[PDB]
Amino acid sequence: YNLICYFTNWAQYRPGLGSFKPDDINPCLCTHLIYAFAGMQNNEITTIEWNDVTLYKAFNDLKNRNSKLKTLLAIGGWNFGTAPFTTMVSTSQNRQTFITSVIKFLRQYGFDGLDLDWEYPGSRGSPPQDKHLFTVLVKEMREAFEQEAIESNRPRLMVTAAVAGGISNIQAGYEIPELSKYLDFIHVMTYDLHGSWEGYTGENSPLYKYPTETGSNAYLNVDYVMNYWKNNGAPAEKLIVGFPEYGHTFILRNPSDNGIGAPTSGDGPAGPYTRQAGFWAYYEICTFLRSGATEVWDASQEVPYAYKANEWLGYDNIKSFSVKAQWLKQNNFGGAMIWAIDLDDFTGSFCDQGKFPLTSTLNKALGIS
Ligand SMILES: CC(=O)N[C@@H]1[C@@H](O)[C@H](O[C@@H]2O[C@H](CO)[C@@H](O)[C@H](O)[C@H]2NC(C)=O)[C@@H](CO)O[C@@H]1O
Ligand SMILES: CC(=O)N[C@@H]1[C@@H](O)[C@H](O[C@@H]2O[C@H](CO)[C@@H](O)[C@H](O)[C@H]2NC(C)=O)[C@@H](CO)O[C@H]1O
């Protein structure tokens, strides 16, 4: 099985113990590390942070301590939008320009592949033709990587993609049968399935539906999303289940109503290191659990939640990671991807569970080491 671990090039700016750079990664935990994110300019891949080139080298230097480790560079993401992707795939000329720049970029800076993180073809302003043109891009990229590999005597560059976990986005964005033929792996973003945008509490990445859920609400679980991809043309062995090392936060309208579906108000509280409303890293969650919070096991969905006064948290822990790891193995899936390794308790000083408790749980459960 594969354990694919995303690293983010803005984590370096978190204060104090939150600051995370490539040298903080244990090179033996994962089979693949993915660098989030590269940008694009004039249909060519490019850096985004002032020190990306330095971080690239430290990132790929991790392979000096693990002969099996592979690295990839992710391009795009949520804030990147869709407009540059729409322009780049619109013509064969622009796709060739981009693909050519990618091969040169990855080989110069030491990456073993590219992870396409377009959010999303056919949505967020992307026109309908991008559903098919995305397949063309991946096909042309896979073929160009294959050519470069056989001519250079080097292992072929990987082409992967982070893909939507929302059914509406999936249907508008991906030709699953043909796309799955050319991607090496399909990293399914089976998280952000509930959050403060809904106005009530819900789990970030529940494995199963809540018992009373019907209709489109019954889409919002890992089991449904993964089986959607599998049953609509994707081979199970290429499908990678998304594992969040963070949770989503809410403000309860009434602290006395603190179950699943309890009413909530604004965007949710922010954490002292990630400093973004609605979002807590796992190491920030451990601090919350030690501040007097009540812990509850969501038995139907196989995930935890916790609350204290007016704050409510839906999240993942060792127990839920273990349940999902066993589940994905018994469903013949390709492994797990983690968003993101800089959100684990990488110092070990927050959770009293050792270093990288969530990532290590998957390392052991997936037979990585
Ligand atoms: C694949 C993807 O788009 N994942 C999202 C992350 O990008 C989000 O992180 C946020 O990313 C922006 C752009 O780099 C940063 O400016 C922002 O600080 C960062 N916030 C945090 C807490 O890391 C993430 C949270 O919004 O949601 C997805 O994971
Ligand atoms: C399954 C699904 O499509 N859920 C949607 C969420 O993804 C989305 O949340 C946003 O997700 C982005 C990654 O895809 C994050 O970068 C972004 O921070 C996050 N926005 C938040 C937490 O406010 C929400 C809100 O846009 O919609 C869901 O439908």
PDB file of all heavy atoms in Angstrom, residues 6 8-10 14 37 76-79 117 119 162 189 191-192 246 274-276 279 339 342-343, ligand 1:
ATOM      1  N   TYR A   6       1.216  14.991   2.136  1.00  0.00           N
ATOM      2  CA  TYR A   6       1.353  16.352   1.642  1.00  0.00           C
ATOM      3  C   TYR A   6       2.100  17.213   2.652  1.00  0.00           C
ATOM      4  O   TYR A   6       1.879  17.113   3.864  1.00  0.00           O
ATOM      5  CB  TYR A   6      -0.017  16.971   1.360  1.00  0.00           C
ATOM      6  CG  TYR A   6      -0.675  16.509   0.080  1.00  0.00           C
ATOM      7  CD1 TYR A   6      -1.469  15.370   0.060  1.00  0.00           C
ATOM      8  CD2 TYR A   6      -0.523  17.221  -1.105  1.00  0.00           C
ATOM      9  CE1 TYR A   6      -2.080  14.947  -1.099  1.00  0.00           C
ATOM     10  CE2 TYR A   6      -1.134  16.804  -2.274  1.00  0.00           C
ATOM     11  CZ  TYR A   6      -1.913  15.666  -2.263  1.00  0.00           C
ATOM     12  OH  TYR A   6      -2.529  15.234  -3.416  1.00  0.00           O
ATOM     13  N   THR A   8       3.128  21.459   3.088  1.00  0.00           N
ATOM     14  CA  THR A   8       2.679  22.765   2.617  1.00  0.00           C
ATOM     15  C   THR A   8       3.761  23.809   2.863  1.00  0.00           C
ATOM     16  O   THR A   8       4.326  23.880   3.960  1.00  0.00           O
ATOM     17  CB  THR A   8       1.365  23.178   3.297  1.00  0.00           C
ATOM     18  OG1 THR A   8       1.560  23.344   4.707  1.00  0.00           O
ATOM     19  CG2 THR A   8       0.293  22.125   3.060  1.00  0.00           C
ATOM     20  N   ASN A   9       4.046  24.618   1.839  1.00  0.00           N
ATOM     21  CA  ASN A   9       5.153  25.566   1.888  1.00  0.00           C
ATOM     22  C   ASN A   9       4.801  26.869   2.604  1.00  0.00           C
ATOM     23  O   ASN A   9       5.629  27.785   2.621  1.00  0.00           O
ATOM     24  CB  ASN A   9       5.668  25.862   0.472  1.00  0.00           C
ATOM     25  CG  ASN A   9       4.644  26.560  -0.411  1.00  0.00           C
ATOM     26  OD1 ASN A   9       3.471  26.688  -0.058  1.00  0.00           O
ATOM     27  ND2 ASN A   9       5.090  27.007  -1.577  1.00  0.00           N
ATOM     28  N   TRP A  10       3.613  26.972   3.205  1.00  0.00           N
ATOM     29  CA  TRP A  10       3.294  28.094   4.079  1.00  0.00           C
ATOM     30  C   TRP A  10       3.328  27.725   5.555  1.00  0.00           C
ATOM     31  O   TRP A  10       3.259  28.623   6.401  1.00  0.00           O
ATOM     32  CB  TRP A  10       1.914  28.665   3.741  1.00  0.00           C
ATOM     33  CG  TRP A  10       0.794  27.690   3.911  1.00  0.00           C
ATOM     34  CD1 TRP A  10       0.066  27.466   5.042  1.00  0.00           C
ATOM     35  CD2 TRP A  10       0.265  26.815   2.913  1.00  0.00           C
ATOM     36  NE1 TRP A  10      -0.881  26.501   4.812  1.00  0.00           N
ATOM     37  CE2 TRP A  10      -0.782  26.087   3.509  1.00  0.00           C
ATOM     38  CE3 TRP A  10       0.576  26.574   1.571  1.00  0.00           C
ATOM     39  CZ2 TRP A  10      -1.519  25.135   2.812  1.00  0.00           C
ATOM     40  CZ3 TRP A  10      -0.160  25.626   0.879  1.00  0.00           C
ATOM     41  CH2 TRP A  10      -1.194  24.921   1.500  1.00  0.00           C
ATOM     42  N   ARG A  14       4.114  29.538  10.443  1.00  0.00           N
ATOM     43  CA  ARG A  14       3.385  29.406  11.691  1.00  0.00           C
ATOM     44  C   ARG A  14       4.310  29.729  12.863  1.00  0.00           C
ATOM     45  O   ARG A  14       5.514  29.459  12.809  1.00  0.00           O
ATOM     46  CB  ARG A  14       2.810  28.001  11.823  1.00  0.00           C
ATOM     47  CG  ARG A  14       1.686  27.768  10.834  1.00  0.00           C
ATOM     48  CD  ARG A  14       1.231  26.332  10.763  1.00  0.00           C
ATOM     49  NE  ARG A  14       0.180  26.185   9.766  1.00  0.00           N
ATOM     50  CZ  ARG A  14      -0.048  25.084   9.065  1.00  0.00           C
ATOM     51  NH1 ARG A  14       0.686  23.997   9.228  1.00  0.00           N
ATOM     52  NH2 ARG A  14      -1.034  25.077   8.173  1.00  0.00           N
ATOM     53  N   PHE A  37       2.454  24.211  -2.720  1.00  0.00           N
ATOM     54  CA  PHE A  37       2.025  24.090  -4.112  1.00  0.00           C
ATOM     55  C   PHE A  37       3.006  24.810  -5.019  1.00  0.00           C
ATOM     56  O   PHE A  37       3.720  25.715  -4.588  1.00  0.00           O
ATOM     57  CB  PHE A  37       0.643  24.718  -4.350  1.00  0.00           C
ATOM     58  CG  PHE A  37      -0.487  24.025  -3.660  1.00  0.00           C
ATOM     59  CD1 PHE A  37      -1.110  24.616  -2.576  1.00  0.00           C
ATOM     60  CD2 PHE A  37      -0.960  22.812  -4.120  1.00  0.00           C
ATOM     61  CE1 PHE A  37      -2.159  23.996  -1.945  1.00  0.00           C
ATOM     62  CE2 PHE A  37      -2.018  22.186  -3.490  1.00  0.00           C
ATOM     63  CZ  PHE A  37      -2.616  22.781  -2.401  1.00  0.00           C
ATOM     64  N   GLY A  76      -1.498  24.027  -8.074  1.00  0.00           N
ATOM     65  CA  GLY A  76      -2.866  24.484  -7.938  1.00  0.00           C
ATOM     66  C   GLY A  76      -3.322  24.678  -6.507  1.00  0.00           C
ATOM     67  O   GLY A  76      -2.690  25.399  -5.727  1.00  0.00           O
ATOM     68  N   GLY A  77      -4.427  24.036  -6.154  1.00  0.00           N
ATOM     69  CA  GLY A  77      -5.019  24.184  -4.840  1.00  0.00           C
ATOM     70  C   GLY A  77      -6.246  25.073  -4.880  1.00  0.00           C
ATOM     71  O   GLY A  77      -6.636  25.618  -5.917  1.00  0.00           O
ATOM     72  N   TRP A  78      -6.859  25.222  -3.706  1.00  0.00           N
ATOM     73  CA  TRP A  78      -8.119  25.953  -3.608  1.00  0.00           C
ATOM     74  C   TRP A  78      -7.953  27.407  -4.039  1.00  0.00           C
ATOM     75  O   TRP A  78      -8.667  27.888  -4.928  1.00  0.00           O
ATOM     76  CB  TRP A  78      -8.650  25.857  -2.175  1.00  0.00           C
ATOM     77  CG  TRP A  78      -9.913  26.628  -1.898  1.00  0.00           C
ATOM     78  CD1 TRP A  78     -10.022  27.787  -1.184  1.00  0.00           C
ATOM     79  CD2 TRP A  78     -11.245  26.287  -2.311  1.00  0.00           C
ATOM     80  NE1 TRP A  78     -11.335  28.185  -1.125  1.00  0.00           N
ATOM     81  CE2 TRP A  78     -12.105  27.282  -1.807  1.00  0.00           C
ATOM     82  CE3 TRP A  78     -11.793  25.231  -3.046  1.00  0.00           C
ATOM     83  CZ2 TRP A  78     -13.481  27.260  -2.025  1.00  0.00           C
ATOM     84  CZ3 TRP A  78     -13.158  25.210  -3.260  1.00  0.00           C
ATOM     85  CH2 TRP A  78     -13.987  26.217  -2.752  1.00  0.00           C
ATOM     86  N   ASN A  79      -7.011  28.127  -3.422  1.00  0.00           N
ATOM     87  CA  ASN A  79      -6.877  29.558  -3.687  1.00  0.00           C
ATOM     88  C   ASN A  79      -6.312  29.853  -5.068  1.00  0.00           C
ATOM     89  O   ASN A  79      -6.415  30.991  -5.537  1.00  0.00           O
ATOM     90  CB  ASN A  79      -5.984  30.225  -2.640  1.00  0.00           C
ATOM     91  CG  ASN A  79      -6.590  30.212  -1.244  1.00  0.00           C
ATOM     92  OD1 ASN A  79      -5.877  30.043  -0.260  1.00  0.00           O
ATOM     93  ND2 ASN A  79      -7.900  30.406  -1.149  1.00  0.00           N
ATOM     94  N   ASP A 117      -3.612  19.464  -8.861  1.00  0.00           N
ATOM     95  CA  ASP A 117      -4.571  19.843  -7.830  1.00  0.00           C
ATOM     96  C   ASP A 117      -5.491  20.952  -8.329  1.00  0.00           C
ATOM     97  O   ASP A 117      -5.609  22.008  -7.697  1.00  0.00           O
ATOM     98  CB  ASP A 117      -3.836  20.280  -6.560  1.00  0.00           C
ATOM     99  CG  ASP A 117      -3.156  19.122  -5.853  1.00  0.00           C
ATOM    100  OD1 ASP A 117      -2.562  18.267  -6.542  1.00  0.00           O
ATOM    101  OD2 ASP A 117      -3.208  19.067  -4.606  1.00  0.00           O
ATOM    102  N   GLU A 119      -8.868  22.613  -8.682  1.00  0.00           N
ATOM    103  CA  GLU A 119     -10.103  22.620  -7.905  1.00  0.00           C
ATOM    104  C   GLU A 119     -11.060  23.640  -8.514  1.00  0.00           C
ATOM    105  O   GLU A 119     -11.035  24.812  -8.132  1.00  0.00           O
ATOM    106  CB  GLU A 119      -9.819  22.939  -6.433  1.00  0.00           C
ATOM    107  CG  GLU A 119      -8.854  21.978  -5.770  1.00  0.00           C
ATOM    108  CD  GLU A 119      -8.781  22.171  -4.266  1.00  0.00           C
ATOM    109  OE1 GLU A 119      -9.676  22.837  -3.704  1.00  0.00           O
ATOM    110  OE2 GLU A 119      -7.833  21.654  -3.647  1.00  0.00           O
ATOM    111  N   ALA A 162      -5.136  15.168  -7.193  1.00  0.00           N
ATOM    112  CA  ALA A 162      -6.096  15.306  -6.109  1.00  0.00           C
ATOM    113  C   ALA A 162      -7.453  15.670  -6.700  1.00  0.00           C
ATOM    114  O   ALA A 162      -7.568  16.646  -7.447  1.00  0.00           O
ATOM    115  CB  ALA A 162      -5.638  16.373  -5.118  1.00  0.00           C
ATOM    116  N   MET A 189     -10.170  13.500  -2.227  1.00  0.00           N
ATOM    117  CA  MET A 189     -10.230  14.428  -1.099  1.00  0.00           C
ATOM    118  C   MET A 189     -11.492  14.139  -0.284  1.00  0.00           C
ATOM    119  O   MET A 189     -12.478  14.880  -0.287  1.00  0.00           O
ATOM    120  CB  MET A 189     -10.171  15.863  -1.604  1.00  0.00           C
ATOM    121  CG  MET A 189      -8.852  16.179  -2.288  1.00  0.00           C
ATOM    122  SD  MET A 189      -8.654  17.910  -2.746  1.00  0.00           S
ATOM    123  CE  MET A 189      -9.727  18.015  -4.164  1.00  0.00           C
ATOM    124  N   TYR A 191     -12.543  14.586   2.622  1.00  0.00           N
ATOM    125  CA  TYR A 191     -12.613  15.392   3.832  1.00  0.00           C
ATOM    126  C   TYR A 191     -13.264  16.723   3.467  1.00  0.00           C
ATOM    127  O   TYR A 191     -13.677  16.941   2.325  1.00  0.00           O
ATOM    128  CB  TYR A 191     -11.230  15.562   4.473  1.00  0.00           C
ATOM    129  CG  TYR A 191     -10.091  15.777   3.499  1.00  0.00           C
ATOM    130  CD1 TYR A 191     -10.002  16.943   2.749  1.00  0.00           C
ATOM    131  CD2 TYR A 191      -9.090  14.827   3.351  1.00  0.00           C
ATOM    132  CE1 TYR A 191      -8.957  17.146   1.866  1.00  0.00           C
ATOM    133  CE2 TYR A 191      -8.040  15.022   2.469  1.00  0.00           C
ATOM    134  CZ  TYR A 191      -7.981  16.185   1.729  1.00  0.00           C
ATOM    135  OH  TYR A 191      -6.936  16.393   0.857  1.00  0.00           O
ATOM    136  N   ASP A 192     -13.368  17.611   4.455  1.00  0.00           N
ATOM    137  CA  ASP A 192     -14.176  18.824   4.321  1.00  0.00           C
ATOM    138  C   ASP A 192     -15.600  18.468   3.908  1.00  0.00           C
ATOM    139  O   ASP A 192     -16.250  19.190   3.150  1.00  0.00           O
ATOM    140  CB  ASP A 192     -13.564  19.806   3.322  1.00  0.00           C
ATOM    141  CG  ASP A 192     -12.169  20.258   3.711  1.00  0.00           C
ATOM    142  OD1 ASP A 192     -11.913  20.478   4.913  1.00  0.00           O
ATOM    143  OD2 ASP A 192     -11.325  20.402   2.803  1.00  0.00           O
ATOM    144  N   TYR A 246      -6.422  17.151  10.620  1.00  0.00           N
ATOM    145  CA  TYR A 246      -7.010  18.364  11.162  1.00  0.00           C
ATOM    146  C   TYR A 246      -8.491  18.082  11.361  1.00  0.00           C
ATOM    147  O   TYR A 246      -9.017  17.067  10.899  1.00  0.00           O
ATOM    148  CB  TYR A 246      -6.810  19.554  10.219  1.00  0.00           C
ATOM    149  CG  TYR A 246      -7.580  19.402   8.931  1.00  0.00           C
ATOM    150  CD1 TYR A 246      -8.862  19.922   8.797  1.00  0.00           C
ATOM    151  CD2 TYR A 246      -7.035  18.719   7.851  1.00  0.00           C
ATOM    152  CE1 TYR A 246      -9.576  19.772   7.624  1.00  0.00           C
ATOM    153  CE2 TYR A 246      -7.738  18.566   6.674  1.00  0.00           C
ATOM    154  CZ  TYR A 246      -9.005  19.092   6.564  1.00  0.00           C
ATOM    155  OH  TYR A 246      -9.704  18.933   5.391  1.00  0.00           O
ATOM    156  N   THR A 274      -2.497  27.620  13.542  1.00  0.00           N
ATOM    157  CA  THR A 274      -2.992  27.669  12.171  1.00  0.00           C
ATOM    158  C   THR A 274      -3.743  28.968  11.897  1.00  0.00           C
ATOM    159  O   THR A 274      -3.785  29.424  10.749  1.00  0.00           O
ATOM    160  CB  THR A 274      -3.881  26.454  11.890  1.00  0.00           C
ATOM    161  OG1 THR A 274      -4.875  26.328  12.916  1.00  0.00           O
ATOM    162  CG2 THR A 274      -3.043  25.178  11.838  1.00  0.00           C
ATOM    163  N   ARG A 275      -4.330  29.568  12.930  1.00  0.00           N
ATOM    164  CA  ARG A 275      -4.863  30.932  12.877  1.00  0.00           C
ATOM    165  C   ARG A 275      -5.819  31.127  11.701  1.00  0.00           C
ATOM    166  O   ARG A 275      -5.745  32.108  10.957  1.00  0.00           O
ATOM    167  CB  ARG A 275      -3.719  31.945  12.843  1.00  0.00           C
ATOM    168  CG  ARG A 275      -2.875  31.901  14.114  1.00  0.00           C
ATOM    169  CD  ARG A 275      -1.690  32.849  14.077  1.00  0.00           C
ATOM    170  NE  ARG A 275      -2.087  34.206  13.731  1.00  0.00           N
ATOM    171  CZ  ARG A 275      -2.566  35.094  14.591  1.00  0.00           C
ATOM    172  NH1 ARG A 275      -2.716  34.808  15.876  1.00  0.00           N
ATOM    173  NH2 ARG A 275      -2.907  36.302  14.150  1.00  0.00           N
ATOM    174  N   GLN A 276      -6.753  30.187  11.562  1.00  0.00           N
ATOM    175  CA  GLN A 276      -7.776  30.242  10.527  1.00  0.00           C
ATOM    176  C   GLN A 276      -9.084  29.731  11.111  1.00  0.00           C
ATOM    177  O   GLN A 276      -9.144  28.604  11.611  1.00  0.00           O
ATOM    178  CB  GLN A 276      -7.382  29.409   9.305  1.00  0.00           C
ATOM    179  CG  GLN A 276      -8.423  29.450   8.200  1.00  0.00           C
ATOM    180  CD  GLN A 276      -7.972  28.747   6.936  1.00  0.00           C
ATOM    181  OE1 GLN A 276      -6.943  29.091   6.349  1.00  0.00           O
ATOM    182  NE2 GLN A 276      -8.740  27.753   6.511  1.00  0.00           N
ATOM    183  N   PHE A 279     -10.814  25.724  11.546  1.00  0.00           N
ATOM    184  CA  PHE A 279      -9.768  24.762  11.195  1.00  0.00           C
ATOM    185  C   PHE A 279      -8.791  24.625  12.358  1.00  0.00           C
ATOM    186  O   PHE A 279      -8.207  25.621  12.790  1.00  0.00           O
ATOM    187  CB  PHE A 279      -9.046  25.246   9.926  1.00  0.00           C
ATOM    188  CG  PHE A 279      -7.963  24.328   9.426  1.00  0.00           C
ATOM    189  CD1 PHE A 279      -8.186  23.507   8.328  1.00  0.00           C
ATOM    190  CD2 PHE A 279      -6.706  24.325  10.012  1.00  0.00           C
ATOM    191  CE1 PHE A 279      -7.182  22.677   7.845  1.00  0.00           C
ATOM    192  CE2 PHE A 279      -5.703  23.497   9.539  1.00  0.00           C
ATOM    193  CZ  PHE A 279      -5.941  22.672   8.453  1.00  0.00           C
ATOM    194  N   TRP A 339      -3.612  14.916   4.453  1.00  0.00           N
ATOM    195  CA  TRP A 339      -3.561  16.374   4.478  1.00  0.00           C
ATOM    196  C   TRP A 339      -3.579  16.817   5.939  1.00  0.00           C
ATOM    197  O   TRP A 339      -4.617  16.728   6.602  1.00  0.00           O
ATOM    198  CB  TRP A 339      -4.715  17.021   3.716  1.00  0.00           C
ATOM    199  CG  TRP A 339      -4.443  18.478   3.587  1.00  0.00           C
ATOM    200  CD1 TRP A 339      -4.726  19.449   4.503  1.00  0.00           C
ATOM    201  CD2 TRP A 339      -3.765  19.130   2.509  1.00  0.00           C
ATOM    202  NE1 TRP A 339      -4.280  20.666   4.055  1.00  0.00           N
ATOM    203  CE2 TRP A 339      -3.691  20.499   2.829  1.00  0.00           C
ATOM    204  CE3 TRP A 339      -3.224  18.690   1.298  1.00  0.00           C
ATOM    205  CZ2 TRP A 339      -3.098  21.431   1.982  1.00  0.00           C
ATOM    206  CZ3 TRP A 339      -2.642  19.617   0.457  1.00  0.00           C
ATOM    207  CH2 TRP A 339      -2.581  20.972   0.804  1.00  0.00           C
ATOM    208  N   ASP A 342       2.352  18.473   8.153  1.00  0.00           N
ATOM    209  CA  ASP A 342       2.689  19.559   9.066  1.00  0.00           C
ATOM    210  C   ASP A 342       1.594  19.834  10.093  1.00  0.00           C
ATOM    211  O   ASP A 342       1.788  20.690  10.961  1.00  0.00           O
ATOM    212  CB  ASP A 342       3.004  20.843   8.278  1.00  0.00           C
ATOM    213  CG  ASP A 342       1.942  21.188   7.249  1.00  0.00           C
ATOM    214  OD1 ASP A 342       0.831  21.598   7.646  1.00  0.00           O
ATOM    215  OD2 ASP A 342       2.227  21.065   6.034  1.00  0.00           O
ATOM    216  N   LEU A 343       0.463  19.125  10.026  1.00  0.00           N
ATOM    217  CA  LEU A 343      -0.624  19.270  10.984  1.00  0.00           C
ATOM    218  C   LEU A 343      -0.647  18.159  12.027  1.00  0.00           C
ATOM    219  O   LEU A 343      -1.385  18.275  13.012  1.00  0.00           O
ATOM    220  CB  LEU A 343      -1.968  19.309  10.244  1.00  0.00           C
ATOM    221  CG  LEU A 343      -2.062  20.384   9.157  1.00  0.00           C
ATOM    222  CD1 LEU A 343      -3.356  20.239   8.369  1.00  0.00           C
ATOM    223  CD2 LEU A 343      -1.953  21.769   9.766  1.00  0.00           C
TER     224      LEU A 343
HETATM  225  C1  LIG B   1      -5.645  21.089  -1.898  1.00  0.00           C
HETATM  226  C2  LIG B   1      -6.093  22.354  -1.117  1.00  0.00           C
HETATM  227  O1  LIG B   1      -6.376  23.352  -1.706  1.00  0.00           O
HETATM  228  N1  LIG B   1      -6.153  22.287   0.289  1.00  0.00           N
HETATM  229  C3  LIG B   1      -6.583  23.409   1.153  1.00  0.00           C
HETATM  230  C4  LIG B   1      -5.385  24.226   1.809  1.00  0.00           C
HETATM  231  O2  LIG B   1      -4.776  24.997   0.837  1.00  0.00           O
HETATM  232  C5  LIG B   1      -5.932  25.203   2.878  1.00  0.00           C
HETATM  233  O3  LIG B   1      -4.866  25.892   3.503  1.00  0.00           O
HETATM  234  C6  LIG B   1      -4.797  27.281   3.319  1.00  0.00           C
HETATM  235  O4  LIG B   1      -4.129  27.486   2.088  1.00  0.00           O
HETATM  236  C7  LIG B   1      -3.895  28.837   1.710  1.00  0.00           C
HETATM  237  C8  LIG B   1      -3.197  28.907   0.292  1.00  0.00           C
HETATM  238  O5  LIG B   1      -1.919  28.358   0.386  1.00  0.00           O
HETATM  239  C9  LIG B   1      -3.016  29.520   2.782  1.00  0.00           C
HETATM  240  O6  LIG B   1      -2.827  30.834   2.420  1.00  0.00           O
HETATM  241  C10 LIG B   1      -3.766  29.450   4.145  1.00  0.00           C
HETATM  242  O7  LIG B   1      -2.986  30.033   5.121  1.00  0.00           O
HETATM  243  C11 LIG B   1      -3.963  27.924   4.507  1.00  0.00           C
HETATM  244  N2  LIG B   1      -4.631  27.711   5.819  1.00  0.00           N
HETATM  245  C12 LIG B   1      -4.230  26.631   6.669  1.00  0.00           C
HETATM  246  C13 LIG B   1      -4.968  26.467   8.013  1.00  0.00           C
HETATM  247  O8  LIG B   1      -3.368  25.870   6.367  1.00  0.00           O
HETATM  248  C14 LIG B   1      -6.770  24.381   3.914  1.00  0.00           C
HETATM  249  C15 LIG B   1      -7.335  25.311   5.026  1.00  0.00           C
HETATM  250  O9  LIG B   1      -8.134  26.281   4.427  1.00  0.00           O
HETATM  251  O10 LIG B   1      -7.833  23.740   3.290  1.00  0.00           O
HETATM  252  C16 LIG B   1      -7.482  22.791   2.299  1.00  0.00           C
HETATM  253  O11 LIG B   1      -6.741  21.816   2.931  1.00  0.00           O
END
